Symmetry: C3
């Protein structure tokens, strides 16, 4: 029905965070968002990464979560976000009591918007 739609769209969209809100934190250096690059692939294949992001493959997050700080709010991203890799990671983080979102648009969006990207 019309209610179930709004309810599903509200929760679903809640799993994401606007890339603008992440860009504002990044510039203002207010540091309240930590960006996790959760795609599975060697640095040789990725060669890219959002400015200040922390490499942490999705298939290892459930085993390396102890490196993260609970008080921080995490923002995870994959190659395109059109896969289930972002949500997979998110479920782990949300269950461990963390507060995390999937970056709307993912890496593709971010590079397409010409936003800060580094090589390292």
């Amino acid at each position: 029905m019309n209610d179930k739609k709004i309810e599903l769209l509200t929760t679903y969209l809640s799993l994401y965070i606007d890339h603008h809100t992440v860009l504002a934190d990044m510039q203002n250096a207010t540091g309240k968002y930590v960006v996790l690059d959760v795609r599975n692939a060697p640095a040789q294949v990725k060669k890219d990464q959002i400015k200040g992001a922390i490499a942490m493959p999705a298939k290892d997050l459930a085993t390396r979560i102890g490196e993260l700080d609970p008080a921080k709010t995490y923002v995870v991203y994959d190659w395109t976000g059109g896969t289930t890799l972002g949500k997979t990671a998110l479920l782990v983080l949300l269950s461990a009591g963390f507060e995390a979102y999937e970056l709307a648009g993912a890496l593709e969006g971010w590079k397409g918007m010409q936003l800060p990207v580094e090589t390292l």
Copy 2:
């Protein structure tokens, strides 16, 4: 269990509309649907669109919604159904009372079927 999977799939699928139903609208010219290209990327990168679509990014659809017909049914689309643009636009529309759906297959699936695309 499956009762949960079935409930999600039913609501989720109700957010979309088959491209076979939208095409049949413009070929028979019944003015039943209005196609909205909610892509945020600039006109340059887009280069083309769906024959008859009204370009209107998901980021502005919230304000430019004053130029839409409350009685008409709207169908939003993007490059690929792998982003929250369609769903965000749907939250905006379905909330203002409008009735809308996401174009199943986005522009990518519409081109793959060699369907009519107007350059602009």
Copy 3:
């Protein structure tokens, strides 16, 4: 919103099945998964499919319901992870009592990994 999102992510992810699981089952001839290509596009359009897959159009799934064995585990796949035919089928299948899962990554991600994909004619 916490539990709601954990509920959604859990149920949503239970729809799919890892591709490492589907491949490791066809390369080991374990055959515990029956892959179904539920694309509605004609053969002339989709001149390729996952190796050893049954062409079960999502639009003819109910019409040919008797051709499915309620004992086998079905794995459906679409064009890309954005299309909705995979989930449309999953609905008919799950409701009819069948055990089904949607291939994570769809054909697009299956081809982009150099995985086995024969061509029909």
